[PDB]
Amino acid sequence: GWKYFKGNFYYFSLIPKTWYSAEQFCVSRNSHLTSVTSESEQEFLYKTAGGLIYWIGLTKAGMEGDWSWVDDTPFNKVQSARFWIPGEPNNAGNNEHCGNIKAPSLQAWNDAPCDITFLFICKRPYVP
Ligand SMILES: CO[C@H]1O[C@H](CO)[C@@H](O)[C@H](O)[C@H]1NC(C)=O
Ligand SMILES: [Ca+2]
């Protein structure tokens, strides 16, 4: 069921999980919750999501609570500004330390509590 896009395969899950149980599932399939590093990747992802919410690899790191990618892609604060839903990350209830694709727009991301269950997206490199 993996979908191919620009050097990577993507798994859009059929069952919802917490952010971490999702990441564990991805790792068991030799992947990670997806990073997003271009406008074209964001578009591929939200279009494929078809209006449903999917955990991606966004999660907090460091004392300052900076956002990061679980697959260790450096997080670019400047280049990613255009990818959040206006008002996000708003850190609701001071307990939203993971990120998902929520809105069907380039401005797609929301921070939500890591312990809520959602469908999720894994990303796995193709290595020729
Ligand atoms: C009302 O709460 C929801 O909407 C806000 C944005 O208005 C979001 O910022 C907030 O994360 C989201 N909560 C959950 C649990 O998904
Ligand atoms: Ca939020």
Author numbering: 198 to 325
From the paper:
Langerin, a C-type lectin on Langerhans cells, mediates carbohydrate-dependent uptake of pathogens in the first step of antigen presentation to the adaptive immune system. The extracellular portion of langerin contains a C-type carbohydrate recognition domain (CRD)2 that binds sugars and a neck region that mediates formation of trimers stabilized by a coiled-coil of α-helices. As in other C-type lectins, the CRD of langerin contains a primary Ca2+-dependent sugar-binding site where Ca2+ forms direct coordination bonds with two vicinal hydroxyl groups of a monosaccharide.
To determine the molecular basis for the enhanced binding of GlcNAc-terminated glycans caused by the K313I change, crystal structures of the carbohydrate recognition domains of langerin-I313, langerin-D288/I313, and wild type langerin in complex with GlcNAc, α-Me-GlcNAc, and two GlcNAc-terminated trisaccharides (GlcNAcβ1-3Galβ1-4Glcβ-CH2CH2N3 (TR54) and GlcNAcβ1-3Galβ1-4GlcNAcβ-CH2CH2N3 (TR55)), representing the terminal portions of poly N-acetyllactosamine chains that are ligands for langerin detected on the glycan array, were solved. The 3- and 4-OH groups of the sugar are coordinated to the principal Ca2+ and form hydrogen bonds with Glu-293 and Asn-307 and with Asn-287 and Glu-285, respectively. However, the equatorial N-acetyl substituent at the two position of GlcNAc makes several additional secondary contacts, including water-mediated hydrogen bonds with Lys-299 and Asn-297. In addition, there are van der Waals contacts with Pro-310, which in turn interacts with Ile-313. An alternate rotamer of the Ile-313 side chain brings it into direct van der Waals contact with the N-acetyl group of the GlcNAc. Structural analysis shows that enhanced binding to GlcNAc may result from Ile-313 packing against the N-acetyl group. Interestingly, langerin-I313 shows enhanced binding of many GlcNAc-terminated glycans, for example glycans 536, 584, 547, 177, 179, and 531, as compared with wild type langerin, which binds only weakly to these glycans.
